């Protein structure tokens, strides 16, 4: 039950952030909606920093770890919204931006995970 | 707040039995445009066909000379909120 | 904006909760490509695809239900960040073949399930 | 419920000043193993080094002949709940 509240509180803040950022920015550049990209990049960054940080604080309450990762990052990032954007582009015959979206989302999210991990790793060293 | 309806629908070239139409794409992911045409005098079947989202022109053939046609174009488009939906039409009248 | 916020939170919380339950139950069974995280992305891909075809045919559906299913449920259920750390960990573990396989199976799998969801409903109607 | 601690830690080959150790990997994504070693008797300093997660063997060098060493291995691993964390150790005694 305490773990469930972590997922819901964190998840709700994540989902809400995604919704606000997406409705505000997605329509600015429809070939690669930047609101959906930014939330995936930002979640990639937070989970990377969480990765490095939680390793060094092994006595942190599982509540906070679960609220940040499964909750916030899990709620903030989205695979389904990325997929329909890509699916729509494929159906529109816009194959170059369908590929670019997939690559920029995947490559971008892993880069931001690395940046999050190594910035904190370099700070502690 | 971004319009999904095409703009500047016009007949760019014409023969007595055909029309080449063009329009400006709306700033949204258009999957396909749907072109409709029929005789303005409300006593004829309206016909429709699609064109891909990449194209912003279409040819209408098999028309009768000296007849008024109502021609409309709308989009089947992707947006964030609505997913796949249909836009309102933009519409013109043209006499062959 | 308050009624829209409850749609995102109610849908998002059910999605995040489902992801959490399915992930803790199944991810540890096959750690090279955690199946709980895959299943939720595949399932969200399926739901958003069926939503794609269905909402097109019901244009007078309340924006509340569309927002609860897409931004809420599918957005909360799917995850890009959890997919990224799994892949990042594999890269750091020197397990490059499963890092690539995870990325491909998640992306290709999620688009396939979006297509299946869209075309099954399109063929029914 | 899946253990992240290695199993069957053993010395597979030995010289007077070195040990080749091996272990069975736990069924989790191990990022690196941490090998520790120190003289079983009392208060020599325990030393550690890491080995990549792909490897399931390590060489310990610079040991003294005829001395009892306590050797432990633990993992730095990824799991769903805990992210990066450290396992409990598995431990053995060996006399060079
Ligand atoms: C890597 C994983 C992949 C997973 C599978 C996803 C498949 C997505 C594409 C399927 O949708 C089709 O896409 C065609 C291409 O856009 C469309 O063709 C449309 O556009 C073409 C122009 O490119 C015309 O020739 C066609 O007649 C016209 O139907 C067609 O309507 C649409 O149903
Ligand atoms: C994401 C996973 C699936 C990826 C699909 C496979 C990878 C395809 C690589 C790019 O393909 C090219 O894309 C151009 C740009 O889209 C097309 O342009 C041509 O064809 C288009 C057809 O839709 C026209 O709209 C263009 O004007 C015309 O230049 C061209 O034919 C096509 O070979
Ligand atoms: C597709 C776009 C991707 C963009 C982002 C990619 C970010 C990936 C970060 C990888 O992190 C490194 O991975 C190495 C490789 O696993 C590790 O080497 C470790 O493991 C190796 C395996 O043999 C050893 O050779 C090294 O000495 C040892 O440090 C190293 O520690 C770790 O920091
Ligand atoms: F998905
Ligand atoms: F992400
Ligand atoms: F993954
Ligand atoms: Na999510």
Numbering used by the authors:
A (entry chain A): 2 to 126
B (entry chain D), D (entry chain C): 1 to 96
C (entry chain B): 1 to 125
What does the paper say about this structure?
Fluc channels, present in all classes of life except higher animals, allow passive transit of F- ions across the membrane down their electrochemical gradient. Bacterial Fluc channels are constructed as small, dual-topology dimers; the two subunits, each of ~120 residues, span the membrane in opposite orientations to form the functional complex. These channels are notable for this unusual architecture as well as for exceptionally high F-/Cl-selectivity. A Fluc homologue from an E. coli virulence plasmid, nicknamed ‘Ec2’, was used for all experiments.
We determined crystal structures of both Met mutants to test the prediction above regarding F- coordination. As with the Tyr substitute, the Met structures are virtually identical to WT, and all residues surrounding the substitutions are unmoved (Cα rmsd ~0.3 Å from WT). The Met side chains in both take on a twisted conformation, filling approximately the same space as the Phe ring in WT. As predicted, in both Met mutants F- ions are coordinated by the γ-methylenes located in nearly the same positions as the coordinating Phe ring carbons in WT, as though the substituted linear side chains attempt to mimic Phe’s aromatic ring in occupied volume and F--binding electrostatics. As with the Tyr mutant, the similar structures offer no explanation why F80M is functionally active and F83M is not. The Met side-chain configuration in the F80M structure is in striking agreement with this idea, but the functional impairment of F83M, which offers a similar configuration, remains puzzling. F83 coordinates its fluoride in conjunction with H106, which is the only other residue in this construct that will brook no substitution. This raises the possibility that more precise orientation is required here than at F80. Previous removal of the central phenylalanines (F80I, F83I) led to a loss of fluoride density in crystal structures, suggesting that the F83M and F80Y mutants inhibit transport via a mechanism fundamentally different from the simple loss of a binding site.
